[PDB]
PDB file of C-alpha atoms in Angstrom:
ATOM      1  CA  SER A   1      -8.444  21.858  13.336  1.00  0.00           C
ATOM      2  CA  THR A   2      -7.151  24.090  10.953  1.00  0.00           C
ATOM      3  CA  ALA A   3      -3.482  22.293  11.865  1.00  0.00           C
ATOM      4  CA  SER A   4      -3.136  18.603  12.562  1.00  0.00           C
ATOM      5  CA  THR A   5      -5.124  16.272   9.690  1.00  0.00           C
ATOM      6  CA  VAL A   6      -2.494  13.599   9.008  1.00  0.00           C
ATOM      7  CA  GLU A   7      -3.332  11.762  11.687  1.00  0.00           C
ATOM      8  CA  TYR A   8      -3.638   7.696  12.166  1.00  0.00           C
ATOM      9  CA  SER A   9      -2.352   4.566  13.369  1.00  0.00           C
ATOM     10  CA  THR A  10      -1.170   1.414  11.665  1.00  0.00           C
ATOM     11  CA  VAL A  11      -2.605  -1.185  10.161  1.00  0.00           C
ATOM     12  CA  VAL A  12      -2.564  -5.160  11.102  1.00  0.00           C
ATOM     13  CA  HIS A  13       0.476  -5.116  13.091  1.00  0.00           C
ATOM     14  CA  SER A  14       1.287  -8.397  13.128  1.00  0.00           C
ATOM     15  CA  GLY A  15      -1.157 -11.210  14.168  1.00  0.00           C
TER      16      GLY A  15
ATOM     17  CA  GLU B   1      15.963   6.027   4.651  1.00  0.00           C
ATOM     18  CA  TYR B   2      14.799   9.415   2.409  1.00  0.00           C
ATOM     19  CA  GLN B   3      16.456   8.322  -0.824  1.00  0.00           C
ATOM     20  CA  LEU B   4      14.341   4.962  -0.758  1.00  0.00           C
ATOM     21  CA  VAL B   5      11.351   6.579  -0.325  1.00  0.00           C
ATOM     22  CA  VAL B   6      11.950   9.469  -2.920  1.00  0.00           C
ATOM     23  CA  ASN B   7      13.097   6.505  -5.395  1.00  0.00           C
ATOM     24  CA  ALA B   8       9.657   4.893  -4.924  1.00  0.00           C
ATOM     25  CA  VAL B   9       7.951   8.130  -5.848  1.00  0.00           C
ATOM     26  CA  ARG B  10       9.215   8.066  -8.923  1.00  0.00           C
ATOM     27  CA  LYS B  11       8.385   4.691  -9.830  1.00  0.00           C
ATOM     28  CA  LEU B  12       4.922   5.347  -7.937  1.00  0.00           C
ATOM     29  CA  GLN B  13       4.539   8.832  -9.656  1.00  0.00           C
ATOM     30  CA  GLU B  14       5.164   7.464 -12.891  1.00  0.00           C
ATOM     31  CA  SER B  15       2.257   4.882 -12.640  1.00  0.00           C
ATOM     32  CA  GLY B  16      -0.219   7.885 -12.534  1.00  0.00           C
ATOM     33  CA  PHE B  17      -2.069   7.022  -9.090  1.00  0.00           C
ATOM     34  CA  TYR B  18       0.159   9.212  -7.203  1.00  0.00           C
ATOM     35  CA  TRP B  19      -1.352  12.929  -7.219  1.00  0.00           C
ATOM     36  CA  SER B  20       1.084  15.517  -5.910  1.00  0.00           C
ATOM     37  CA  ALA B  21      -0.588  19.131  -5.191  1.00  0.00           C
ATOM     38  CA  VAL B  22      -2.759  18.306  -2.127  1.00  0.00           C
ATOM     39  CA  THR B  23      -2.184  17.974   1.568  1.00  0.00           C
ATOM     40  CA  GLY B  24      -0.809  15.035   4.013  1.00  0.00           C
ATOM     41  CA  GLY B  25      -4.496  13.448   4.567  1.00  0.00           C
ATOM     42  CA  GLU B  26      -6.117  16.067   2.467  1.00  0.00           C
ATOM     43  CA  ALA B  27      -4.617  14.465  -0.845  1.00  0.00           C
ATOM     44  CA  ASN B  28      -5.632  10.939   0.368  1.00  0.00           C
ATOM     45  CA  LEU B  29      -8.574  11.575   1.240  1.00  0.00           C
ATOM     46  CA  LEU B  30      -9.865  13.184  -1.972  1.00  0.00           C
ATOM     47  CA  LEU B  31      -9.957   9.932  -3.218  1.00  0.00           C
ATOM     48  CA  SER B  32     -13.055   9.570  -1.487  1.00  0.00           C
ATOM     49  CA  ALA B  33     -14.543  12.425  -2.399  1.00  0.00           C
ATOM     50  CA  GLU B  34     -13.722  11.186  -6.505  1.00  0.00           C
ATOM     51  CA  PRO B  35     -12.296   7.826  -6.842  1.00  0.00           C
ATOM     52  CA  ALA B  36     -14.437   5.859  -4.283  1.00  0.00           C
ATOM     53  CA  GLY B  37     -13.221   2.688  -3.257  1.00  0.00           C
ATOM     54  CA  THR B  38      -9.864   4.174  -4.195  1.00  0.00           C
ATOM     55  CA  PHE B  39      -6.627   5.118  -2.105  1.00  0.00           C
ATOM     56  CA  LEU B  40      -3.643   7.236  -3.049  1.00  0.00           C
ATOM     57  CA  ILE B  41      -0.770   8.701  -1.774  1.00  0.00           C
ATOM     58  CA  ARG B  42       0.350  12.233  -1.470  1.00  0.00           C
ATOM     59  CA  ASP B  43       4.201  13.681  -1.291  1.00  0.00           C
ATOM     60  CA  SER B  44       4.175  14.668   2.615  1.00  0.00           C
ATOM     61  CA  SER B  45       5.470  18.446   2.632  1.00  0.00           C
ATOM     62  CA  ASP B  46       8.809  19.468   4.503  1.00  0.00           C
ATOM     63  CA  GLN B  47      11.575  18.641   2.168  1.00  0.00           C
ATOM     64  CA  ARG B  48       8.900  16.604   0.118  1.00  0.00           C
ATOM     65  CA  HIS B  49      11.354  13.552   0.701  1.00  0.00           C
ATOM     66  CA  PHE B  50       8.255  11.550   2.006  1.00  0.00           C
ATOM     67  CA  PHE B  51       4.849  10.412   0.890  1.00  0.00           C
ATOM     68  CA  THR B  52       1.790   9.283   3.212  1.00  0.00           C
ATOM     69  CA  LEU B  53      -0.841   7.160   1.772  1.00  0.00           C
ATOM     70  CA  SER B  54      -4.608   6.901   3.280  1.00  0.00           C
ATOM     71  CA  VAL B  55      -7.967   4.613   2.355  1.00  0.00           C
ATOM     72  CA  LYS B  56     -11.666   5.213   2.212  1.00  0.00           C
ATOM     73  CA  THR B  57     -14.091   3.000   4.267  1.00  0.00           C
ATOM     74  CA  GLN B  58     -17.236   3.206   6.161  1.00  0.00           C
ATOM     75  CA  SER B  59     -15.082   3.149   9.409  1.00  0.00           C
ATOM     76  CA  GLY B  60     -13.529   6.351   8.588  1.00  0.00           C
ATOM     77  CA  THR B  61     -10.448   7.634   6.417  1.00  0.00           C
ATOM     78  CA  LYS B  62      -7.031   6.668   7.368  1.00  0.00           C
ATOM     79  CA  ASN B  63      -3.663   7.801   6.321  1.00  0.00           C
ATOM     80  CA  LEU B  64      -0.255   5.666   7.158  1.00  0.00           C
ATOM     81  CA  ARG B  65       3.445   6.236   5.890  1.00  0.00           C
ATOM     82  CA  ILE B  66       6.561   3.859   5.439  1.00  0.00           C
ATOM     83  CA  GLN B  67       9.519   3.562   7.905  1.00  0.00           C
ATOM     84  CA  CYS B  68      13.092   3.221   6.866  1.00  0.00           C
ATOM     85  CA  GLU B  69      15.035   0.733   9.028  1.00  0.00           C
ATOM     86  CA  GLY B  70      19.057   1.141   8.582  1.00  0.00           C
ATOM     87  CA  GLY B  71      18.533  -0.021   4.911  1.00  0.00           C
ATOM     88  CA  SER B  72      15.030  -1.371   4.816  1.00  0.00           C
ATOM     89  CA  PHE B  73      11.567  -0.554   3.737  1.00  0.00           C
ATOM     90  CA  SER B  74       8.591  -1.248   6.159  1.00  0.00           C
ATOM     91  CA  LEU B  75       5.240   0.082   6.987  1.00  0.00           C
ATOM     92  CA  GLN B  76       6.337  -0.732  10.504  1.00  0.00           C
ATOM     93  CA  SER B  77       9.285  -1.489  13.059  1.00  0.00           C
ATOM     94  CA  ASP B  78       9.149  -5.569  12.924  1.00  0.00           C
ATOM     95  CA  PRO B  79      11.090  -7.754  10.545  1.00  0.00           C
ATOM     96  CA  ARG B  80       7.972  -9.959  10.013  1.00  0.00           C
ATOM     97  CA  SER B  81       8.441 -10.021   6.434  1.00  0.00           C
ATOM     98  CA  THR B  82      11.867 -10.419   5.484  1.00  0.00           C
ATOM     99  CA  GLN B  83      10.847 -12.771   2.888  1.00  0.00           C
ATOM    100  CA  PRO B  84      12.322 -10.204   0.167  1.00  0.00           C
ATOM    101  CA  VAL B  85      15.801  -9.004   0.305  1.00  0.00           C
ATOM    102  CA  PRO B  86      17.399  -6.212   2.815  1.00  0.00           C
ATOM    103  CA  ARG B  87      17.496  -3.241   0.923  1.00  0.00           C
ATOM    104  CA  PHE B  88      14.950  -4.437  -2.177  1.00  0.00           C
ATOM    105  CA  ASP B  89      12.059  -2.216  -3.555  1.00  0.00           C
ATOM    106  CA  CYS B  90      11.319   0.605  -1.149  1.00  0.00           C
ATOM    107  CA  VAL B  91       7.559   1.340  -1.117  1.00  0.00           C
ATOM    108  CA  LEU B  92       7.018  -1.396  -3.655  1.00  0.00           C
ATOM    109  CA  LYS B  93       7.150  -4.186  -0.654  1.00  0.00           C
ATOM    110  CA  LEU B  94       4.729  -1.372   1.537  1.00  0.00           C
ATOM    111  CA  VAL B  95       2.729  -0.903  -1.565  1.00  0.00           C
ATOM    112  CA  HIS B  96       1.454  -4.675  -1.195  1.00  0.00           C
ATOM    113  CA  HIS B  97      -0.296  -3.266   2.347  1.00  0.00           C
ATOM    114  CA  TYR B  98      -1.548   0.160   0.025  1.00  0.00           C
ATOM    115  CA  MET B  99      -3.028  -2.082  -2.660  1.00  0.00           C
ATOM    116  CA  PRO B 100      -2.601  -5.714  -4.209  1.00  0.00           C
ATOM    117  CA  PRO B 101       0.397  -7.313  -5.779  1.00  0.00           C
ATOM    118  CA  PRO B 102       1.478  -6.217  -9.159  1.00  0.00           C
ATOM    119  CA  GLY B 103       2.164  -8.299 -12.376  1.00  0.00           C
ATOM    120  CA  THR B 104      -0.985  -7.518 -14.491  1.00  0.00           C
ATOM    121  CA  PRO B 105      -3.682  -9.206 -15.147  1.00  0.00           C
ATOM    122  CA  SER B 106      -2.621  -9.802 -19.097  1.00  0.00           C
ATOM    123  CA  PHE B 107      -0.450 -12.956 -19.766  1.00  0.00           C
ATOM    124  CA  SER B 108       0.869 -13.611 -23.379  1.00  0.00           C
ATOM    125  CA  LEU B 109      -2.863 -14.157 -24.460  1.00  0.00           C
ATOM    126  CA  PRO B 110      -3.166 -18.321 -24.279  1.00  0.00           C
ATOM    127  CA  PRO B 111      -4.636 -19.410 -20.747  1.00  0.00           C
ATOM    128  CA  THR B 112      -2.022 -21.048 -19.448  1.00  0.00           C
ATOM    129  CA  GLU B 113      -4.441 -23.135 -17.021  1.00  0.00           C
ATOM    130  CA  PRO B 114      -8.109 -23.491 -18.335  1.00  0.00           C
ATOM    131  CA  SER B 115     -10.458 -23.574 -15.729  1.00  0.00           C
ATOM    132  CA  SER B 116     -13.050 -25.328 -17.202  1.00  0.00           C
ATOM    133  CA  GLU B 117     -15.850 -28.388 -15.975  1.00  0.00           C
ATOM    134  CA  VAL B 118     -13.327 -29.140 -12.804  1.00  0.00           C
ATOM    135  CA  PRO B 119     -15.071 -29.807  -9.902  1.00  0.00           C
ATOM    136  CA  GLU B 120     -13.202 -30.962  -6.628  1.00  0.00           C
ATOM    137  CA  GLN B 121     -10.212 -28.877  -7.124  1.00  0.00           C
ATOM    138  CA  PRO B 122      -7.885 -26.833  -4.689  1.00  0.00           C
ATOM    139  CA  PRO B 123      -8.021 -23.422  -5.925  1.00  0.00           C
ATOM    140  CA  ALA B 124      -4.586 -22.860  -5.094  1.00  0.00           C
ATOM    141  CA  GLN B 125      -2.643 -20.823  -8.014  1.00  0.00           C
ATOM    142  CA  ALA B 126      -0.146 -18.109  -6.761  1.00  0.00           C
ATOM    143  CA  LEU B 127       0.812 -19.970  -3.571  1.00  0.00           C
ATOM    144  CA  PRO B 128       3.885 -22.215  -3.612  1.00  0.00           C
ATOM    145  CA  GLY B 129       4.013 -22.702   0.441  1.00  0.00           C
ATOM    146  CA  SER B 130       4.435 -18.569   0.599  1.00  0.00           C
ATOM    147  CA  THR B 131       2.286 -15.985   1.795  1.00  0.00           C
ATOM    148  CA  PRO B 132       3.597 -13.043   3.591  1.00  0.00           C
ATOM    149  CA  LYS B 133       0.249 -12.142   4.966  1.00  0.00           C
ATOM    150  CA  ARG B 134      -1.037  -8.624   4.072  1.00  0.00           C
ATOM    151  CA  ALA B 135      -4.098  -6.753   5.527  1.00  0.00           C
ATOM    152  CA  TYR B 136      -4.984  -2.613   6.114  1.00  0.00           C
ATOM    153  CA  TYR B 137      -7.432  -1.558   8.524  1.00  0.00           C
ATOM    154  CA  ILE B 138      -7.844   0.317  11.414  1.00  0.00           C
ATOM    155  CA  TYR B 139      -7.583  -0.430  15.290  1.00  0.00           C
ATOM    156  CA  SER B 140     -10.340   1.127  17.805  1.00  0.00           C
ATOM    157  CA  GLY B 141      -7.954   1.607  20.397  1.00  0.00           C
ATOM    158  CA  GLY B 142      -8.464  -1.687  21.145  1.00  0.00           C
ATOM    159  CA  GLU B 143     -10.045  -3.276  18.367  1.00  0.00           C
ATOM    160  CA  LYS B 144      -8.456  -4.618  15.544  1.00  0.00           C
ATOM    161  CA  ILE B 145     -11.362  -3.712  12.646  1.00  0.00           C
ATOM    162  CA  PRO B 146      -9.846  -5.621   9.334  1.00  0.00           C
ATOM    163  CA  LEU B 147     -10.336  -3.914   6.251  1.00  0.00           C
ATOM    164  CA  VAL B 148      -9.799  -5.148   2.468  1.00  0.00           C
ATOM    165  CA  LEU B 149      -8.457  -2.477   0.328  1.00  0.00           C
ATOM    166  CA  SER B 150      -6.694  -2.928  -2.690  1.00  0.00           C
ATOM    167  CA  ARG B 151      -8.404  -0.746  -5.344  1.00  0.00           C
ATOM    168  CA  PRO B 152      -5.702   1.283  -7.645  1.00  0.00           C
ATOM    169  CA  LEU B 153      -6.577   5.570  -8.430  1.00  0.00           C
ATOM    170  CA  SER B 154      -7.202   6.018 -11.994  1.00  0.00           C
ATOM    171  CA  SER B 155      -7.192   9.748 -12.419  1.00  0.00           C
ATOM    172  CA  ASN B 156      -9.757  11.366 -12.498  1.00  0.00           C
TER     173      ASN B 156
END
């Protein structure tokens, strides 16, 4: 895919 | 918001661990191709008033960005870390998630507290009843896979 690359989610939301 | 992120890059880039010249995720991923076991943050394109950081692991490289809330800096939107003050050091609080706490390992010179023969002892130094709990890991779209990351990038 030559476009969207900086994809991701989150880290240790809360607990 | 932007001022908080930009003011952070100024102090964060001064460390040398910030490499401005790659792509959003491609910049952070380069750490896996060179500084293995190291994580770095790049300056998002566009107005260049934002930076994203990603780390390397056996589950895949992930990138994360800081979120500006009114006048506070946080990698999320839940105020579960008001330990510090409002408008404190922007990315600095977020850096704890991208890496370990500041305070070089050096300290004057003499060992304020020696640890020679001393069995039966609570190993609690920097923990005076204060721990905001930190950790960086990727979510399996349903399963939280905890990963421990804490390595600074040293050029090369």
